[PDB]
Each structure stands twice: as C-alpha cells, then as structure tokens.
Subunit: 661 residues, 3 copies
C-alpha cells in the first residue's frame, strides 16, 4: 500500500510563514559549512528516465519555495549523506542541518545488520567473481552456472562458506583462489558441457573384457558408465589404438574445480559428471565425503604440489568416486612428515580407468612427483582397470637414472626409498591390473585383503619390509602370466592367506617371494606353487592333524630343493577295516626313485599289533649305515637269511646273521 | 523518530500558496493520469484501517490538504503511481511519473542481497505453511504436534532443514517433493503415546529366556526396552499367552517418512519411539544417526517395493538403540556393480529383531530382496535376534517362485547372486545368530563374532569364500545349535574358534559338511568339528612347543574312523624330570578302540635303543604289507621271535628271529 | 543515492493556508488522546551532538509553523508508535493522528524478520557474553577474541550453532555454560598467549631420545614440535628433573575451551596451538573431526565427570591431534552403560606427551576416576612418549588399598574390575612406553595391531579375558628389560602374530603369559622366548611341512619343562645325494645327554630302502623296556652279539639272542 503524498520539498522561512523566495541551498560534507567550496559535494538533477546532470551550487529556490534550475522544477540528488544550509535572498541563514541522514534514521537497518546471517547468492550477480567480491560470510550457488575453461575467482582472503545447490557446468577448470583458511565448499556439482565418447570394458555380467575389438564395440557417447580412452588403454588392450575411431582418441573432457594455492580449504560432499577436483599447491586441504562424482579424463581427486613446498595436511577423508579415465585419488610431491599428516582414510573407489589410489612415481617436469609419510587406511578399491592401490615411488618399466628434487639413487637404490607410509586395513576386489602394488625399503604393512581379481593380487618391489596379516584370495583369475603375489626384495611376511575357491592349475606360482621369509600361510595352496627363501612355523603348540573324508590322516614333509611337486617323507595314520573298527596303522615313509612313500615302516597294519620293518633287499654296503650302536637288516637271498650290518658302539662294523629258516 | 507532520500539504509552483480547490490525478507509472484509462483505484483509509474507494480527481482544500465530503482524509493506492497536480485554473502545479522513484527505501534491496534466507516454524501455524514460504533454509524452532499421515509438499525446492525442536506424534510425518541436495539435520521424533515395553535382560546384562521372567519386566516407557512383537512369541515360547492384551499388538512409532525423493540426506537424527522411513527413494542417506531410541517399526528403512529398485541408499555412521524390530533394513535395493548403497560405519544396540537386515521373500506381492550392497565397518551389539541378517531367501519351501526376482528354476533357494560387499564387521551379545546370510558366489572377509548367547554364524551359502572369520564364545546359552553352520560347498580360509568358555555342554562347534577349511586356530574340541575337508597344505618347517608337565604331542585323527579318538600319534616324553637332558620319542596306533595301544619307542629310560612291538601270536600271511619287509611275531611254545618276511620278489617266508 | 529534501517539519492549519502560529502539540500512546497527561509519552530534544534532553509537553509551534523551545528551533524525538494532536493558539484542534506509524508504514521489517536466518557476530559486540546474550540461532566468531582465564559465558539455554572463523586467544580456560541440547560449535581455534619452553625427545631421523641430557639439549620456546615437561618426564627420562633449568619446569600453558555441565553439545573441526578441550560434567557431548589441534599442558580432549552423574554419551569421533604434554584423549568417571554409549571411534593421536587414549586410574580428589562400558575402535595412535592406548582402571605403582566411589577391592581385586569396554580394530606404531595396555577382568579384545615400537608392544594386567587376532610386530626395539607382550592373568589368546624383521637376540621373552592358554602363533619367533601355560593347535587338518633353503625338512618337538632351548625329538626328511635325486631318508630322533637328535631310527639312508635301528649300547636293564609284546635290542660286546630284552605278551621278561656271527 502506497500513501498519496507530496514528495517535492518546499523550503520555508524559520521565523515567519513564507517561502524562502529566491533563496539558495548549499550541499556538502557532513558536519561542515557547505557554503565553502572546499566542503561542497557533487549535486545532480535526476531525470525521469534516471539519467543525471551535474549542476553547480548554490541550488536556487524559486518564489514558491521549490528548487529550480533555469526556472524549471528539478529533483536534486547526491551520492552520499550530506550537510545542508539554506539561505534567504538577503543572505541570512534560514536553516542548517549538519547531517540530513540523522533526521530520518532507519533504525531497522542497524538492527537487521546485527541480527541476520550474511550470505550472497549467485542468482543476484552476473558472474561468479561478482558474487565472490560481494561475499562476507556465506555464498550460495543457487543457479546453474556456465563457466569457461580457466575462469578464475579471487575470494579476497575471506573465510567463506560456499553452499552449492546448483551446478557448475563447463569443460575445463574453474579456478578458485585466495580463499582464507577455514573456507568450506559444500555440495559442489561439476558437469562437463561436452558429452564424450566412452568405452565400457566390462560385460552385463560384470566380467572384464580384454579383447581390443570387444572394447571398441562398447563405444557410446555418455558422461558416465565408462571412460574416455587414454594412451594407457593402448597398453591395457593391445591393438585398440588402431581399432579406435579418431573421435574416441585424444579426448580431454573434464569439468574440474581447481583450488589453487590455498591453505585450510575443505570440499565436502562434492559430486558431478565428467568431474574432477584439483588441489594445486595447497596445504591442509581436504576432500571430505565425496558424494560419488563420476570422473572425466583427469584424476577425480588430485593433490599436486610440484611447485612450492611439499604438500602436507592434504587428505581424502570418506566418500567415494566412480569411473574416470585415470586414478580416483592421487598425490604428487606430498610429505606428511613424521606426524603422517595427509593421505586417504575411509575412501571407496569404483571403476577407476587407472588406479583407485595412486602416489605418483618418477620425475614429472623438472622435479619429483613422489610422496612420503602418508596414511592409506580403512579404504576400499573395487574394479579398477589397473591397480587397487598403487603406492610405488620409483618407475617400474623404463626407470629414470636419477631423481631430481628427491634422494639420489646413490643414496637409495631404485625401489628402496624410505617412503614411511602408514598402510593398514585396505580392501581391494575386482582389479584387472594389480590389486595392491608398492615399493620402498623399511615399510610396515598390515591387514590387507585382496580378493576376486582378474589381475594379480599384489606386486611388491619392497626391501627389508614387513607384511602382517595379508590375504590374497582368488587373484589372477584370468590366469595371466603372473604370480598372485610377488615380492622382489628381502622381506618378512607374517600371516598370509592364499586361495579361495578358484583352482590354480592354470597358473604359475601363487607366491613368488624369492628373498622373503614367510610364516603362517593358510588355505588350499598348491605347495608346488610356493616360492620363498624360508618358510617356518617356529612357535606352534601341541598339534593334531584332523582328516575328514579320507581313510587316512597325514603329516607330510616336502624338501623343495629335492622336489617341489613330491613329498619326500610322511607320517600317516591309516584305517584298518572301515569306519568304527577301533583300529588304525601308523606309517613312516621316505621317497625313493621319485616315488613318494616308496619305503616305509608300519605299526599295527591289519591290527597285527607289530612293527613292519623294511630291510635292504640285497647285501648292504658299509656306507649304508649312518650311526654308531645301530643295525641295518639286509637280505641274503642265496641262503634265505636276513643279516644285520652292525655299527658297534665303538664305531666299527660287523656283519651278523639276524634270521634264518 | 522525529516528531513530524505526516499529512501532506500541496502548494503551488509559481508563488507560495495552497493549491486551493486543486485537483490530483493518480495513475499508472510514467503515464498521464488525467486519462481515466491510465487511472488506478484510490481509497480513503480510515483510522480503523478500513478502506473506501472514491472517484478522481482528489480535491485540495484552502489549506492545501486533501479532502472528501468536507473532511480531511488520508488517501492510499495499491501500487506505485504517477501523480499530476492541477490548480483551480487547470494549470499544472506538478507531475511525478513515479512517486516511488522519489527517494525509494534502498535498504530492502541491499538486505535482500546480503542476508541468508531462512523461514522458521514459530512464524507459521502448520508445517506446510512454513514449507511453502521456504526458499533456502527452514528452521524448526518450536515443538510441532503432527497427525499421522500429515504430508508436506516442499515444491521441489533444495532446502536445508535445521531442527532445534521436536516433531511429536504417533504415526508418520511425510515429507514429499524435496529437491536433490536437500538436507535435514538434527530431527527429533517423539511419540505421543508411552507404550508397554519388555526388557529381556537383567541388571547384570544377561539375557532372559523365560517368558514369565520377561513378562515381569513390563513397564510403560518410551525407552529401555521394546514393544512386544509376533517374533517374541517364538523367541520366548509361551509369552503370547502370558502377556496382557495391552502389551500385545501395540504399534507406537513416530516416523519421519521421506517419500519418493532423490538425493535427500537426514543427518544427526534422534528421538524416542522414533523411526525413519525412506519410501521409494534413491540416492538418499541416513548419516550420523544420533542414537535414536526406536519404536515398533524399523529404526532406519529403505523400502523400494514400488517403482525402480532402490539405489544409492546408505546408512553412514551413527548408531541406534532399542526398537521392536531391526535397526537398519533394506527392501528391494540394488547397488549395481558399483555397490552404490548399504551400511558403512554403523552401530546398532539392542535391536528387538536384528541390527542390519536385508529382507527375504515376497512382501507386498513382489520381491523384498537386495543385491550389490555394502556391509562394512559396522558393529551390532545385543540384538534379540541377529547381528547381521543378510539372507535373501526364506529357508523353507524351495519350490516357490520369486515374483519380481530371479526365477527359482534359474537360481535355487539360497543361491541368488547377491554380490554384496561384506567386510570388517563385529558382533557381540546376539541372542539369535551373530552373522547370518545366504547366496551363491559370495566373498566375505574379516568378520568377528564374540560373546553371544545364540549361535555365532548361520550361513546358507554356496560356492562362497570366507576369509579371516572369528567365532569366539558363542552359543553361550548352549542351545541345541552349532557355533557356526554352513550348508553348501564353501571355502573357509582362517577360522578362529573358542575363547574362554568351555564347549563341554554343547554339540558341534562347526557344522560345515560340504565346506573345505584351512587355518582353524583355538582350543577347539576336534570331535566338534565337522567339515568336508580340513588341511594345512602350506606350512613351513614345524615345531610343536609343549608347556605341559612332561610331554609334547603331534596327534592324528581320522574322522571317518572315530570323531572322538586319536588314531595315532608322535609323542616326545621326558625321561626323569626337568633338566634331565633326555626324552623318548614314540609312534603309536589305536587298536581295540584304545588310543596309543600299540607303539614303537626310541630312547625309553635313556636306553638309546628302539623298542619294537611284535605280533603277540602267529602272524597271518596278510599281516605284512610291503615287499622287502619283515614283521616280528611271537611263538609262545618256543619262547622265540619269528619273522614273517615278504621277500624282495614278493614271496612270503617265515624265519626264526630270536631264541634262547 | 540520497535526495535533497527539507527534513524539519512545518505545522500548518487545516481549513486555511496558515502556520499553526503559537500552537501546541501533544504526543501520546497510539489510538489515545495525548492531551490527557495519562496517555502522554516521553519526548526529547535531540541536540546536534546526538544527546537528548527530556522536556514536558506540549510542544510549542512558532509563527513559521516550526517547533521551538525558548525561542530556538529544535529537533524533537520520541518513539515510533505514537498519537499526535495539534491545537491552534485558540485551543481549537487542528489535527489528530491516532498512530503516526500507520501513515507511511514500514512493511519491510515484518517481511525481513520472517525470511532471513538469525545470526549475531562477535564483531558487533565488546564481549563474548554480549554476543551470546544477543544470539538466537547463529553466532559467528568473526574476530579474534582475547579471553581471560575463567571467563564464563552463559548461553541462556539456547540451542545455538556457533561458527568460528577466528581465534580464541588466551592462557587458561574459556568456559561455556548453559548451551541448549543440540548446540554445535564448529571450527573453534584455541591459541595460548604464552610461547612456553618445550622439549622434543626425538631426532631428525625420528629416533626417540632416552637420555635426560640429550632431551634437555632440545629445549626451545615454541607452541609446537614438542611439549612442556611435566613430573611424568622425571620418571620417563631419569635424571631430567635436576638437569632442567627452572624456566622449563612447572609450566602450565594450555588454551582450553571448557564446556561445563552441558547436555548434547558437539564441538566439530576444532583446532589450535597449545590447545585443550575440556567437557566437565557433560553428557551426550562429542568431539567430532578434531582438525589436528596441537596440544598444551593438559589433555587435548578430556571428558571429566568426577562430580554429579557418571558421564555417558560422551565420544571422540574421527579427527586427530598432535603433541601435548599428557594424553590426547582421556576419560574420567564415564560409564557408557550396556549400550556402550561413549568412547573413541575413528581417531588418530600423534606424539602424545603421555598416551594416545587414556582411561584414568585410581582415585582423583575424593572419588573414582575410572571408566566402564566405553568403545575403543577403529583408532590409531602413533609415537606416544608413554602408551598408545592406556585402558587400565587401577593404579600400577603404589596402588590405593581402596576404591572410593567404585567397586571395593573385596569384590574385585586390583586390576580385575569388570570394565566391559568394547575394544576392536586398533593400530599403534612408534610407542616409547607400551603400545597397548589395559587391565580388567572378563575383557574381550580383538584385532589389535602393534608395530615398530621402541617400548613393549603390550602390557596386559588382565584376567579371565579373551584376545583374538593380536599382532605384536617388532616391539621393544630398544631392548629394554621387558617382554614384547606380557599378560598377567588367566587369559585366552586366539591368533597371535609375533616378530617382523628385527632380531630378538638382545631381548628377554617375546611373550610372557604364564597363566594364559594360547593358539595360533605365527612368525619367526624364537621358541625359547615363548612362555605360556598352554600352547596348542587342536584343530589343524592334514599337514605338510614345506622346507625351503635347506637339504632337509623338520617337524620338531620341544618340551619346555625339559629344556626351553633344545628340541627333545624330531621327525626329519633329508635329501639323499643331490637335488633331483628323487630320494630322501626319514629320521625319528630323541634327545639324550642334552644332545638333540642323539638317538635315532632312520628309513632309507643312502637310498638303501631299509630301516636303521638303534640298539642299547650295553646290557639292557629290566626297566628299559616299557610295554608288553615288545622287544628291545641290546649289545653284548664280549660275544659280538645282539640280544633282545623281550617283554612277552603276558608281561614277563625274557632275554633272547637276536643276532650273532
Ligand atoms: Ca636271530
């Protein structure tokens, strides 16, 4: 409701009831005398269409007490608050107001400025920068915003809480800079403008495709449920480079939120399609509870600190991601320090086009991309095209001969860096590459479970390292020419579960750990497919061997130097008669002529209650008897007699007759 | 406020005079209001606030003030307007194209831009009124008594609903049409009714099992127990008849229902007799539940019996307590290959049914089953029934088809390809079964079930793999049950059995008749192991360290022969005492159902010789097994040892071996 | 911008065009007659300086129609809502306005008050109490606030969301009281004013210092990268008490946020320097996602409930802390109930000056400081000066003879309270004292991993307790006179991994658990360094012993009561000839005269296909033969004959001739 009123002011005298006819008005700085030029401020006629014309002072008051310019009634305005002095035609002062704002003070605005939460919203601004400049505390993203690649926003060092309720859409990087420590960005949703060509190298039954032509046949234009091919696919799927159409090669679609050179910024509940998150030269930043962004061409979550100080304080905490052409979560040139201040905790990666979690190896540009002292715990990687966890620091194939910006090779050889990562409680399932890969010297690794992988379970280029409670369960299910677990260097493994339900008959070795000392293997492993430097159970208690569904129980010995495929000796218990007979025989055996159990001593065969003793089947040579005060029975066929080669207590030999007709 | 004179006066523009008998025309902005087509309504506004519309022009009196019927009046318009003033001779005194452009209150413009939008329930009579007014935030700042089925339409808006007071009522408060990304934080649901609840555990936290004892715990409370259900009639046989009618068939729950929404998260929820229902939702999460105390229905339910299969639905973090049925439950959800859904980082205490439940069977005429969910990093303590119930098929009537699911002819009962990602789960105190599941082709890892009155695990699984399972002091009530049962042909790699409680009062520890197992650790009674095959194929060089009084033992047992008697053994026994430097080694075999009946010894009494058992009477031809061996036997009437010799050529001869 | 107007009011007549010369104005309550003094309200002259002088009515109008007071023009002010009556010089009413506000009504405040989020901010108030009193919903800390020790703020029972974007700066405690249930405090940053002297008992290669003089040598003034010495350091580094200068002793610097006697308050994403967080007398409070506060003199996170009801519902959830002089997270007099409603889940502690997580022991003040029914799960403690987890309830050194406020010693002996904590999935690395310590009766503990600790791995003063899947891997690496794991009482251990890659030759026992029954040891343990009451593997299947790196395989027996260092017998398989000979011999041995393997029976030595049988090297005594229907061969040297001591089937002894020339 608008009340009818008379907005145009009139100016009347102070001691009688008259207009200030032919008077003058001066307008100036608050609490000054505006009659003096130095104190005057710009005054403008304001026109109906909202245009302005600056005029000179004094303002002229006509005979009716109204302001006029060249005799025409005008509306005068000023940019800021002002003092006002009114003079009559004789030049006597009629009135003076030091500050006109003080006459009609809007008290509500003082109260409102104090009692309401400050937030600006993108719907009120043409550009994101405009909103950012206006922001004091909150910034609401409340309209879908088309950004251009490289669009850069300066947040002015302010500590902002950016609440996203709409998308940032575009191909390329949206770059946020100069956010103050403590700033948070919640609910951000990045989406590419472009819909790329993607491959989907898995079937409707979730089996991995390995054939290049089969993979090419999956090409579709989509922002999800697949990934844009990269040059690593040319290696992963031999022959695919030639078979892909040109429009499916060299694509580069990612919509990336880039946090540049900020400290103490967290991105919470991020999501998107063809989406990427890049922390470039950041410290003490976190990607928290990622809400399953579907990846594009670049890493989904990247902490890259190739320039400036080594990254520290950078974490992926919770959440999950899906797809992407390369790794889900990756680090370059981060060092958590002794305090292990950084890494990946509580994270899930699904279907990384490369690996679920990656610490980069080798030189990138002019310097090291490697990482030290990071945590990798309580995390899960499922169905990566390459690796579950890739925690190596030195290049496997075609390694550099040096490490600019890192420890020289002369100090630490390749794969022997003191990486010092805290690695515990990780699960990997469905990896096509390697479930769990790493390198380094002096590493402690615990509670790692790798299961149901088409590719190898683990590939460990580690040295003087300790692995505790490792489970490698049905890996290399495609039976590639690979081990299920490989360890290069001289390591200790304490607890190693091998074999689920899949046969290893179509594979090479299960564990190849030629310099490693191992204890506590469990599972239905084919002992011929074990290679270690040493295997021992030094600390077992009293033992029982329980046999089910066989007529015997066995405690066997296998000397791998003699033979990896044949037991060299055994202690058996064998049933006499059948079930419930109350009788069994015990048998001690030795291999001869590569025939297991060729020679044996028996106790209670056929419940006879006696020992059956093997004898030498012809004349025994002197050197057949080993120890003093022992005898060795032997056969003399021509007299149908048993003889005994005796090594007497004094060590001398004598031949006796033992049994005759 | 400055004491001012609000009533306008209108004076002329050429000389200082009132516009006596002047005329004012009021119309559309930027038009000529003298034209009636440009005029807008003008009203007298009375002191009591009533209005009366009058004709134009407005009349100015001798004093320069607007008048109607000889009285000074206040005139108002509904919109911004043009104003033209004419004097008694029709000369124009003034023209204002838009009176609002003279000094607009610029504050509302700046305020609307700089402040966060939020409405609050204290300003509205109903929750719908508040939802309608909301733009960004909605604050629940007063307790609100809802009626069952009360339905709120949020208009597709992406709202941040902050709760700092209670929703109070029996039944469901139903939220609908929230936009993707909406969040509801701190919600507290509380029933109006205080029901009758049972508390089937003692002040020393032992479960009660006697129906009469449980009935004796009846009290009216919204917590520290649960409303009896139909399942209690089975759990406590006879309780149905002993419970008074007022304790039976109660249905008190105050439920926040999120209906048919996508991308809604409920965070830090709590309450008393509280439930949370996501009905026909996708990509919704129950996050960091702040220990709501449950009612009759499930505490957290993702139910997708209608519409598309549920996906993207999770319980993440938090905990719940009590409730008559399961704490967290799923019907007709499929996480896809991506495993996009399930329960991670969750704790359940004292579920009246189970901690985490995936429904089995048909419900509402379709499948209630679930696929491809995660169950990880979660803990369930003191459920009345199960810790985790992750089965999909009902363990009965294997003929029955699965409407809405895989046909029974494609996948038999309990052999669905459920494909859940199950890892790192802990259960303690279950009265029913700690960990239960079915399915074919399952992988399960890092499960620990300890200190359970009921069985540790009940696995109706087929061609499945279990890695690093620990079942420690379960079936502590000594029900006629196993500690772990596995029906189908599975592999177990790493199974820890037995804590500090004796199994002397129990039947089988593990009954897994089709399963192949390796790596059992613990003081299991070997008679209480039943498996298809047990083996340690990959041990290294071995040492058996005995802390016993005078011996160490490596025993053999053939379960086909006897489940309770060792069939043979390798012993080492001390000669003399501690520090003697001497022991004897002994190889034994069972005969006449007497373990160790027959043996060969090396170094008995430090004699440095081998004591060899001989057949105590004439040896039959078939007593000797292998060629180039001899078997000593006794001939009493010559006080001699003979030897039955099987020569190298396989033929038998009998020789004299020792005589007087 | 601002329009030029004439703010000073003029009062003119209603029926003719004249000023109300020498008129009178009355001002009173809305919709009343203000000429009645009962209805009048205060009116004020507002001077130019903004000051006010109350005057009595009526207001006086001059010949110009303007308000005057003793002949000077004046600005009169009063409350928004009022009635106004104007009278001419004759006392005739000129006008009456029932309610001046109703003329040009501000509708905006009504709309604004409904549509905007309420938050007050510290920049608008001189003191934190001022802001707290003004708050309704939100409270923003947008300026650094210097507090004094003991400064107490009462939040009126209001449910407040306190968002911190600046620091609370001060030595001592800032005390928050009377927060309503559901209140939350986010991003708080406590910082001390003092930079104290701190010690840093670790080197640049992250080796612990143990020498007092070396530790004193590390003294520096800093708020981080070390801690203030306390009296426990006197014990930890013997001699340091006398070597520290006075300025480094008795320091007491912590900047502590104290939440006092509140219910349902959560502190989220807290940080700081020399910072502490104390919940005193609270219930249902949480310290969530601690953002690596760097600690001071007192515990970093403390739930202290020594008065009032036992603490319940109090958790540390997520996050991490660093440094501090004492423990990172600690509890006094909390009981989670059967519900286990409280504890530590998901937490990381680095470099606690005492322990990572501590449940207090003994009497504090006049009552129990102990704790029951708490969770300790999914947490990690790295590099504590004392313990990783200290979950004991009873005092170790000079214990109390009683437990005021708790169970009596007569009901539960020392170290044997039914603490009932839910303990699972814990990792400790780098502890200088004890990695994992506890006491209690009836405890269940599972999935504990302790690795690479200078001090002992575990010290368990527990009884009738159960430990499942424990790993103690390279602990006591400094070779203190200690065990790697000690357990005092009658416990069960099911799964125990011992030994990483470090030799134990410099140590005493690896496990000393004299009253415990243990199964499932894995690792390269020295068997002489195991002490338990009972060690057994009752439930193994068929067994194979696989030997790598040797010409033989072994299944050995050791009777620890006979000898802890020498095996008492063995079953061996030994290669005959070369590798790939396909022949081996089996040997069964027994110790004699303290020489392992002194006496043995062989099968297939030198591939001879016969059994080599040891005989008594002199005349056998009657008592040498054990069982009926057995014979024992023995040597009669004078005649060059083997005889047999025969125990006939009827048990009677006879001596026969077995072999002669
Ligand atoms: Ca003879």
């Amino acid at each position: 409701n608008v009340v009818v009123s008379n907005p145009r002011p009139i100016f009347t005298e102070s001691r009688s009831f008259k207009a200030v006819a032919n008077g003058k008005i001066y307008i100036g700085q608050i609490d000054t005398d505006p009659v003096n030029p130095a104190n005057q401020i710009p005054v403008y006629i304001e026109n109906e269409d909202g245009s302005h014309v600056q005029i000179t002072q004094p303002l002229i008051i006509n005979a009716a007490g109204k302001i006029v310019y060249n005799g025409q009634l005008v509306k005068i305005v000023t940019v800021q608050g002002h003092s006002m002095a009114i003079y009559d035609a004789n030049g006597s002062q009629v009135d003076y107001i030091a500050n006109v704002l003080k006459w009609d003070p809007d008290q509500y605005s003082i109260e409102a400025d104090k009692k309401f939460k400050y937030s600006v919203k993108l719907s009120d601004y043409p550009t994101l920068q405009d909103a950012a400049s206006a922001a004091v505390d909150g910034l609401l993203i409340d309209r879908d915003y088309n950004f251009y690649g490289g669009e850069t926003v300066d947040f002015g060092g302010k500590v902002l809480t950016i609440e996203c309720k709409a998308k940032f859409i575009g191909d390329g990087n949206l770059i946020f800079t100069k956010l103050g420590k403590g700033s948070r960005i919640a609910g951000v949703f990045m989406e590419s403008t472009t819909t790329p060509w993607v491959i989907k190298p898995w079937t409707d039954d979730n089996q991995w495709l390995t054939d290049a032509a089969a993979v090419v046949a999956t090409l579709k234009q989509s922002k999800t449920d697949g990934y844009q091919p990269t040059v690593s696919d040319y290696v992963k799927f031999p022959g695919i480079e030639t078979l892909l159409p040109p429009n499916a090669k060299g694509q580069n679609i990612t919509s990336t939120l880039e946090i540049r050179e900020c400290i103490g910024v967290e991105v919470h509940r991020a999501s998107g399609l063809m989406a990427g998150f890049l922390f470039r030269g950041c410290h003490f930043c976190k990607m928290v509870d990622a809400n399953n962004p579907s990846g594009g061409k670049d890493g989904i979550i990247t902490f890259e600190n190739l320039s400036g100080d080594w990254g520290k304080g950078n974490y992926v905490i919770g959440g999950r991601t899906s797809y992407g052409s390369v790794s889900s979560a990756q680090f370059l040139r981060n060092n958590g320090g002794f305090e292990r201040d950084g890494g990946v905790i509580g994270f899930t990666s699904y279907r990384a086009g490369e690996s679920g979690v990656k610490t980069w190896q080798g030189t990138v540009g002019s310097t090291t991309s490697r990482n030290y002292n990071l945590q990798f715990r309580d995390s899960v990687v499922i169905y990566p095209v390459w690796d579950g966890f890739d925690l190596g620091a030195d290049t496997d194939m075609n390694p550099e001969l040096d490490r600019p910006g890192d420890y020289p090779i002369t100090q630490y050889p390749l794969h022997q860096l003191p990486l010092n990562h805290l690695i515990d409680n990780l699960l990997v399932r469905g990896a096509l590459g390697v479930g769990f890969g790493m390198d380094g010297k002096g590493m402690y690794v615990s509670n790692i479970t790798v299961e149901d992988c088409a590719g190898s379970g683990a590939y460990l280029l580690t040295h003087e390292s300790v692995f505790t409670n490792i489970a490698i369960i049905d890996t290399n299910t495609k039976d590639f020419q690979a081990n299920q677990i490989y360890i290069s260097g001289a390591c200790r493994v304490n607890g190693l579960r091998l074999i689920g339900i899949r046969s290893t008959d179509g594979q090479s070795l299960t564990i190849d750990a030629p310099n490693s000392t191992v204890s506590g293997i469990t599972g239905m492993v084919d002992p011929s497919r074990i290679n270690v430097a040493n295997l021992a159970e030094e600390g077992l208690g009293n033992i029982r061997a329980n046999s089910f569904g066989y007529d015997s129980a066995a405690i066997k010995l296998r000397i791998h130097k003699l033979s990896k495929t044949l037991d060299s000796g055994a202690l058996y218990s064998h049933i006499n008669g059948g079930a419930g007979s109350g009788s069994a025989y015990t048998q001690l055996t030795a291999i001869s002529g590569s025939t297991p159990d060729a020679v044996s001593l028996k106790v209670n065969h056929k419940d006879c209650r006696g020992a059956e003793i093997p004898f030498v089947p012809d004349i025994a040579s002197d050197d057949f008897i080993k120890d003093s005060s022992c005898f060795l029975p032997y056969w003399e066929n021509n007299s149908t007699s048993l003889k005994a080669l005796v090594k007497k207590p004094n060590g001398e030999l004598v031949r006796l007759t033992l049994a005759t007709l």
